[PDB]
């Protein structure tokens, strides 16, 4: 079981999101901080989701860089099945 062996190595390894901020949005939904390593996996699973979108929007920016636009997020989230919306009203 790799994922049990992974979570037992998270007493160290402060992640990119703090546990005072990941734990705040977990307490907002009823998830209470019993184990602080449990928070760090949820903070890691939410990093990997945002990182996978920013890594795939970079491929849609190299073809057309070093700049993240809404026309790069639009085809990047379209394979995810997420239709992002332009503001268009400001």
């Amino acid at each position: 079981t790799p994922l049990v062996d992974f979570l037992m190595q998270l007493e160290d390894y402060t992640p990119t999101i703090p546990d005072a901020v990941t734990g705040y949005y977990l307490n907002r939904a009823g998830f209470e901080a019993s184990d602080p390593r449990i928070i760090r996996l949820i903070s890691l699973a939410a990093q990997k989701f945002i990182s996978d979108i920013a890594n795939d929007a970079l491929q849609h920016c190299k073809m057309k860089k070093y700049t993240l636009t809404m026309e790069d997020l639009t085809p990047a989230l379209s394979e995810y099945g997420i239709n992002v919306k332009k503001p268009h009203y400001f």
Binding site: N27, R28, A29, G30, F31, E32
Partner: protein, 487 residues
Amino acid sequence: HGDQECYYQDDLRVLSSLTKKEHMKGNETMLDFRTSKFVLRISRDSYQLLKRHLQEKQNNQIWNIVQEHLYIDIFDGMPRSKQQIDAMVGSLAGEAKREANKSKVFFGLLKQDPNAPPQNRIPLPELKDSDKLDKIMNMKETTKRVRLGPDCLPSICFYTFLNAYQGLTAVDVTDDSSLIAGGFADSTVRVWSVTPKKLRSVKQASDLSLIDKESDDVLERIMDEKTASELKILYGHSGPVYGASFSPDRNYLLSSSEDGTVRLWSLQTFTCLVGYKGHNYPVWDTQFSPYGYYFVSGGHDRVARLWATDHYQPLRIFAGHLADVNCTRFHPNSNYVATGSADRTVRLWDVLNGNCVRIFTGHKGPIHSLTFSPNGRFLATGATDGRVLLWDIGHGLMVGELKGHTDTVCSLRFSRDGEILASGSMDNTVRLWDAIKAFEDLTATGHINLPENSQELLLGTYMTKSTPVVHLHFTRRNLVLAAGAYS
């Protein structure tokens, strides 16, 4: 729409949006208004002029709309004045029939009272010796309790929530002033001890069993001192907690929220026990019975359910309102449930047979506060029009009207003796009303020609510093407690 009464202004703007058929086919309040009958209590002296203008064939179509969509309930008496008709109208399907308000209601207290129900009418819980020991120290509190009256005005102790940046949506206090619950918009219930005695919870089943066992001081022994705070936060609702209700044995907190569940929190283990999922919609209120077994919860789905803390399914469904059941209050004998609502009606429901036995109309806004007299003979209701209407229960005549408040009256309570009704609103005021001079006088006509006794019944106003009075509580020594988030 311009030549309507001023208290129908929030009713017409829902109708100005309704212009299509399919807009009205999914409203479900105007869909039930179109199929029901407006009751329209009129006198026989005025109905003779109406029927002499409608039975002729010169009009012949507005008479067809009247006898299709309107009931007419005729009473033999004087035609009412305009400021008396204004006091008892304002509800869709308004001014209900007198044949609904003539059923026999057992509005008396349990233990002779001829208006009292038998003890085996509703199957209530049992009592022991420890319960007779409670009433011995309860009447020691009643001693220091002073016949408040219009002279010895009570002292008000405001328990303000200072920071409260998550919005406080629900308060309850126990019957002895020992706990204060807070329902908040961040989906939490927070219990505070107000006596100098910290909140302790038994640590565990694998830990509470290895203690006591005929130790005599059993309650003290199982209580864990490792867990002892002045505040316990309860998590588990996925939405803002709108109802909060303690049980009379000071265990068993109840909470209802936007997610459609009613939750039973223990106060010995400080965990959740049951989640009662009968509504799919926001449950706006809940309350335990004053004997502590049954509880009633009213929600957005226009019913109020009766639960029993033993079944996952309800026992009674009170399904006669046409809008959201905002409030749900038990009678002091717990044989009757009063449910105020957003269609400007208050309805008493018998726990046997689930029948509506009283319909109280005369509010102009959605009813947000309900409270019974300790006699059981009267019922005070408050709504967004700032009016506190005092209803009889054996008669059902809405005899008094208290019109001092400006904004939504969100909390009412009578005294422990019944001497004073306390009213708290969004005007940041705690008004005290003389609840003895209001019922001093108390049919064949359905009204009593109630006076403008509001100025005489006012005893004090007590403006609060930017703080809406969410809860009002009376200590057993007749001390007013109030708890509002400071904005």
